[PDB]
Design a protein around this ligand. Structure first.
Ligand SMILES: N=C(N)c1ccc(/C=N/NC(=O)c2cccnc2)cc1
Ligand SMILES: [Ca+2]
Length: 223
């Protein structure tokens, strides 16, 4: 997260770190057994880390639970990043409490102008490289589909939205991939892609979660 703020320990209780020997992606806990992330975060041997603040120090509220299965969206295209969504099932159910909690799925899509909270352990620099140890947060508005498409001609599908600031300076970044965009208490987005980070006229692009609620529910119901 570039141009954000320190969230505070366990203030984002649905935020997960996906670990394969090291943090490599974010995710969002949606019930005791399931995490939503980006399809581009897919890999084998995932351990889901819940209750994290400093990802390099055991602080007392962690739950580390191995993934039993991953399900990439049936229509994920890794070239265009269309349908950039994946479900991860935990080998055992998380113990849910104030600091480890699920986030509600949307029942309708969010509109341009809605404020959202985007979070993760990704790069904090727009030019160079610096990875934080503690969770970073950014409050950002959803942008109009027209401004999103203008920013990224020929690249924005109906399964994507832009959020952030056309002026630059405030954005998600590398390492935030797969993490949450939460608006009025609903998971509306997943950190998906962008051109660099926090660049002028290049806002973050996010998977449009409201499109996938039917698929998520039915997938969970049979797996
Ligand atoms: N501007 C954003 N909101 C944004 C931009 C990019 C990303 C994702 N980056 N991932 C990478 O670079 C990468 C990752 C692994 C290997 N090689 C390159 C997320 C958000
Ligand atoms: Ca920790």
């Amino acid at each position: 997260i570039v141009g954000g703020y320190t969230c505070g320990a366990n203030t984002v209780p649905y935020q997960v770190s996906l670990n394969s020997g090291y943090h490599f992606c974010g995710g969002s806990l949606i019930n005791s057994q399931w995490v939503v992330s980006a399809a581009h975060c897919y890999k084998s041997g995932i351990q889901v880390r819940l209750g994290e603040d400093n990802i390099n120090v055991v602080e007392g509220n962690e739950q580390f639970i191995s993934a039993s299965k991953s399900i990439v969206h049936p229509s994920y295209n890794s070239n265009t990043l269309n349908n950039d969504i994946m479900l991860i099932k935990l080998k055992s159910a998380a113990s849910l409490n104030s600091r480890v909690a699920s986030i509600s799925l949307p029942t309708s899509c969010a509109s341009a102008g809605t404020q959202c909270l985007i979070s993760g352990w990704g790069n904090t620099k727009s030019s160079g490289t610096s990875y934080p140890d503690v969770l970073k947060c950014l409050k950002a508005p959803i942008l109009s589909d027209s401004s999103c498409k203008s920013a990224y001609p020929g690249q924005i599908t109906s399964n994507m939205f832009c959020a952030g600031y056309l002026e630059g300076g405030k954005d998600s970044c590398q390492g935030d991939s797969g993490g949450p965009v939460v608006c009025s208490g609903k998971l509306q987005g997943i950190v998906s892609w962008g051109s660099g980070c926090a660049q002028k006229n290049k806002p973050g692009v996010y998977t449009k979660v409201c499109n996938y609620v039917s698929w998520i529910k039915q997938t969970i119901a049979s797996n």
